[PDB]
C-alpha cells in the first residue's frame, strides 16, 4: 500500500523496510558483499554502503581515500563478536535484540561503531534497570 505523503507525493509504506529485507537476503546469500569485517577471528560479510549508512566509524573508514579500497577490515579484538553480530543484524533489519546478558557488550560496541541512537537506547534501558 501507499499514501499521500506530506509533500503530496505518493509514498510507499513498506518500501524502505522491503529494501532493507532484500539487502539482508543479499547478505545472507553473499550477493555483492564487498567487505569482510573481522572481529576476534570471526568473519562477517557485508555491504560497505549499508555499514556507512548506519555507523560513524564505517562512514569514516569508507570515505577515506586509502581505506575505501580495503576488502577486509579488522576491528578491535576486545570487541565482543556477538555484540557486533547483534548490531550488524540491527543495521539490516531495524531490530535490536537487546537483553540483560548482552546489553553492556552491545553498548560498548555501538560506542566504538558510533551508532549514537543505539548507545542512547542502551543507556535508557540500563538506567531503567537501576
Ligand atoms: C519478487 N521476488 C523475486 N522475484 C524474482 C527473483 C527474486 C525474487 C526475490 N528475491 C530477491 N529479490 C530482490 N529484488 C527484487 C526482485 C524482483 C522484484 C523486485 C525486487 C521488485 C519486483 O516487483 N520484482 N533482491 C533480492 C532477493 C533475494 F532474496 F534473492 F536476495 S519474489 C519474493 O520471489 O516474488
From Swiss-Prot:
Where in or outside the cell it occurs: the entry states: Nucleus
Coiled coil (UniProt feature) = none
Q: In which tissues is it expressed?
A: Expressed in germinal center T- and B-cells and in primary immature dendritic cells.
Q: Describe the effect of residue 22 to K.
A: Abolishes interaction with NCOR2 and HDAC2, no effect on interaction with CTBP1 and transcriptional autoinhibition
Query: Domain BTB: where?
Result: 33-100
Q: What induces it?
A: Down-regulated during maturation of dendritic cells by selective stimuli such as bacterial lipopolysaccharides (LPS), CD40LG and zymosan. Protein levels decreases upon genotoxic stress in a dose- and time-dependent way.
Q: What is the top-level taxon of the source organism? A: Eukaryota
What is the recorded post-translational modification? Phosphorylated by ATM in response to genotoxic stress. Phosphorylation induces its degradation by ubiquitin/proteasome pathway.
Domain comment from the record reads as follows: The BTB domain mediates homodimerization. Its dimer interface mediates peptide binding such as to corepressors BCOR and NCOR2. Interaction with corepressors through the BTB domain is needed to facilitate the rapid proliferation and survival of GC B-cells but is not involved in the T(FH) formation and BCL6-mediated suppression of T(H)2 and T(H)17 differentiationrequired for GC formation.
Q: What does the record give as the function of this protein?
A: Transcriptional repressor mainly required for germinal center (GC) formation and antibody affinity maturation which has different mechanisms of action specific to the lineage and biological functions. Forms complexes with different corepressors and histone deacetylases to repress the transcriptional expression of different subsets of target genes. Represses its target genes by binding directly to the DNA sequence 5'-TTCCTAGAA-3' (BCL6-binding site) or indirectly by repressing the transcriptional activity of transcription factors.
What is the official name of this protein in its record?
Answer: B-cell lymphoma 6 protein
The record lists the organism as Homo sapiens (Human)
Source organism phylogeny: Eukaryota, Metazoa, Chordata, Craniata, Vertebrata
State which stretch of the full-length protein is shown: 5 to 129 of 706
Amino acid at each position: 500500500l501507499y499514501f499521500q505523503g506530506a509533500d503530496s507525493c505518493i509514498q510507499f509504506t513498506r518500501h524502505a523496510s522491503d529494501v532493507l529485507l532484500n539487502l539482508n537476503r543479499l547478505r545472507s546469500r553473499d550477493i555483492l558483499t564487498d567487505v569482510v569485517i573481522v572481529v576476534s577471528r570471526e568473519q562477517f560479510r557485508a555491504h560497505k554502503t549499508v555499514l556507512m549508512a548506519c555507523s560513524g566509524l564505517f562512514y569514516s573508514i569508507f570515505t577515506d581515500q586509502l581505506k575505501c579500497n580495503l576488502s577486509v577490515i579488522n576491528l578491535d579484538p576486545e570487541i565482543n563478536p556477538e555484540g557486533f553480530c547483534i548490531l550488524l543484524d540491527f543495521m539490516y533489519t531495524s531490530r535490536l535484540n537487546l537483553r540483560e546478558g548482552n546489553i553492556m557488550a552491545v553498548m560498548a560496541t555501538a560506542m566504538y561503531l558510533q551508532m549514537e541512537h543505539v548507545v542512547d537506547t542502551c543507556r535508557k534501558f540500563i538506567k531503567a534497570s537501576e
